[PDB]
Design a protein around this ligand. Structure first.
Ligand code: NAP
Length: 326
């Protein structure tokens, strides 16, 4: 346990809502039945008060039971003490489908409201009659270009959910700087959060700066970089000697140093794990010294950025227009 952990720290969103600086990522892209329940339960017991969820991962039902069981077991804690975030997927950007998606997520989570609701990608795709992702003849998402280029109808729907008090704050995920500029023009409620990939191999500094300078708070998914192993070089973030040197010299884990780096930059961090030992350890986020903070920055600044999450090939849509050359 870390008495000085920054797990007690919150940020204040531009509408006054407080968001815990550390949240637990619940994505379980590989099963099993019951694994999300155990992990979520472990996070709640370990002191997490921020849970990050999404319709896409199809496990909000297990999360709902975990929250309900945790609350039943711990009468001193109230649902209001938890910060719950979920997200609407790309095939559900039509206004009525946005509301349906939150209603569905609220049902599975066994909640009356969520603390944060996000548009998961700035990409609108067609859906099937039964509200699944419609696949085109190449097997990729079928893109609705009108709704993708002019997301106003989708955002109005988020605004209405927010005014209906079904979401205490609304935000975006994977939005770009230009995307934010376009949204600001048509938005009555400014997005409170932009959840994006942020870690030492992808510092995303220009977007992080633009958000902070504009009252949008970033939150970092993949804050540990994934163990996904950089594809053009075959190196892992968690094998990086510079990063490990800072952690080792300060008797902290590599993950804790990476999470402490993110909060120190001034944004939320959403570490994911299925492993109890790692769930427990990742809630112990240190307040980094100036030397540690700077040296991690040296690693980040000494290399070419590498984005681990790019669903180009699945979507049949290229948001970030990144190539081998150029
Ligand atoms: N488009 C979006 O909005 C989006 C995209 C991706 C993710 N997210 C959210 O953010 C979360 C993070 O995504 P991510 O899993 O790709 O990256 P991550 O949080 O940076 O961590 C990925 C992997 O690191 C391992 N790990 C965790 N703690 C560790 C520790 N102390 N020491 C060593 N290894 C550790 C874990 O493996 P084990 O599981 O085996 O323990 C975990 O799978 C997701 O769950 C999700 O809620 C959002």
């Amino acid at each position: 346990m870390m008495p000085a952990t920054l797990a007690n720290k919150t940020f204040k969103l531009n509408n006054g809502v407080e968001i815990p600086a550390v949240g637990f990522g619940t994505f379980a892209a590989e099963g099993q039945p019951g694994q999300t329940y155990a992990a979520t339960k472990a996070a709640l017991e370990a002191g997490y008060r921020h849970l990050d969820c999404a319709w896409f991962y199809q496990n909000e039902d297990e999360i709902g039971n975990a929250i309900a069981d945790f609350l039943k077991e711990n009468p001193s804690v109230k649902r209001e003490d938890l910060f719950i975030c979920t997200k609407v997927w790309n095939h559900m950007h039509a206004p009525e489908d946005v509301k349906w998606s939150l209603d569905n997520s609220l049902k599975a989570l066994r909640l009356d409201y969520v603390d944060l609701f996000l548009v998961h990608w700035p990409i609108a795709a067609e859906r099937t009659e039964d509200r699944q992702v419609k696949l085109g003849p190449d097997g990729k998402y079928v893109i609705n270009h009108e709704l993708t280029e002019n997301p106003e109808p989708t955002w109005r729907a988020m605004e209405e959910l927010y005014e209906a008090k079904k979401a205490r704050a609304i935000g975006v995920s994977n939005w770009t700087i230009d995307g934010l500029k376009k949204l600001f023009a048509v938005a009555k409620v400014k997005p409170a959060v932009n959840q994006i990939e942020i870690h030492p191999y992808l510092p995303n500094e220009e977007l992080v700066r633009f958000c902070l300078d504009n009252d949008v708070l970033p939150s970092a998914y993949s804050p540990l970089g994934s163990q996904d192993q950089v594809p053009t070089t075959g190196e892992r973030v968690r094998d990086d000697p510079g990063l490990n040197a800072v952690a080792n010299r300060s008797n902290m884990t590599l993950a804790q140093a990476l999470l402490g780096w993110g909060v120190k930059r001034g944004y939320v961090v959403l570490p994911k794990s299925s492993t109890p030992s790692r769930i427990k350890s990742n809630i112990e986020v240190p307040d980094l010294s100036e030397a540690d903070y700077q040296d991690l920055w040296k690693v980040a600044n000494g290399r070419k950025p590498t984005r681990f999450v790019d669903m180009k090939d699945t979507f049949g849509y290229d948001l970030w227009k990144e190539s081998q050359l150029e």
